[PDB]
C-alpha cells in the first residue's frame, strides 16, 4: 500500500519516465502517471462540481442542470445518471455529443483531453512490440479520429452509504483520469494498492482491448482492476473525470478486436459483424 506508480512526461512525442524501469512497470502495473502539459482544467473542474446542481442564473449556470441531458435525448447509457448502489452520480458523454451539450470552454477542454490521450496512446505504442504500420487498424481506428471517446464525470456523494464505485476494468485502449483526492485503488500482486493523485499530473491506465492486442507479443500490457473507496460524510464530495478511448464500434470501420502475432501480423480475435449476425439469429429465434 506504499508502492509508487511510475511517472512520465510527454516530451517530443515520447514518454520520459522518472526512472529507467518506468515503462516496464507502467505496462505491468496497468497504471501510471503522466504530467499534464499545462492543460487548462478549469472548465472540467467546474462541470464536475456543478452538473448535478439545479440550474440558476449565476455565472455557473452553463455548467448546471445537466439532469435534463438523459438517454432519450442522446443515446442509451449517455448523459446524466444518479445510480445509488455506489456513491457515484455520473455524467457520461461521447464526443459526437460534446458540441451540442457542453459549454464552449468545456468543449475545448474535452477536445484537448482527447488529443492528449491519443498522443499518450501513440507514445505507448512506440515502445511496444507492434509495427508502426499496424497502429491505426490494431487500435480500432481511434488514432484516425474514428473511435469512441467518452468524457465521464464522477460525483461521489458522501451522504450515500456504499462503495465509491465497484471493481471494474476499463474496456478500451487508454483512460486519462483527472482527480485530486485519495480514493482510487488498483489491484497489484493480489492486494489493493491505494493511489494518491499527484498535483498537475493525470493517472493513465489501459483497457481490455489493449491487453487483448498485446498479450501474445514480446510486450504484454495489463488491463488492471480498480475501484474507489467509500467517501465519508465528514465533508467529502470527491470529484473526478476521465477520458476513455475505445475502438470504433462500426464493423464496417473496425472489424473487431485484434491480436498482434509477431512474425504474422494482426489476427482478428473477435469478429464484430459475425457476432452481430449471431445475435440477429438468436433474437429472431428467441422472441
Ligand atoms: O474516480 C477515480 O478515482 C477513478 C474513476 C474511474 O476509474 C472511472 O471513472 O472509471
Ligand atoms: Fe475506471
Author numbering: 5 to 291
Text of the article:
We subsequently selected the homologous enzymes and finally obtained the crystals of the ternary complexes of PaBcmG (from Pseudomonas aeruginosa), which also catalyzed the conversion of substrate 3 to 4. As a result, we determined a collection of X-ray crystal structures including ternary complexes of SsBcmE, SsBcmC, PaBcmG (with Fe(II) or/and αKG). Likewise, the comparison between PaBcmG•FeII•αKG and PaBcmG•FeII•αKG•3 structures revealed that the C-terminal helix may function as a gate or lid for the active pocket, and the binding of substrate triggers the closure of this gate.
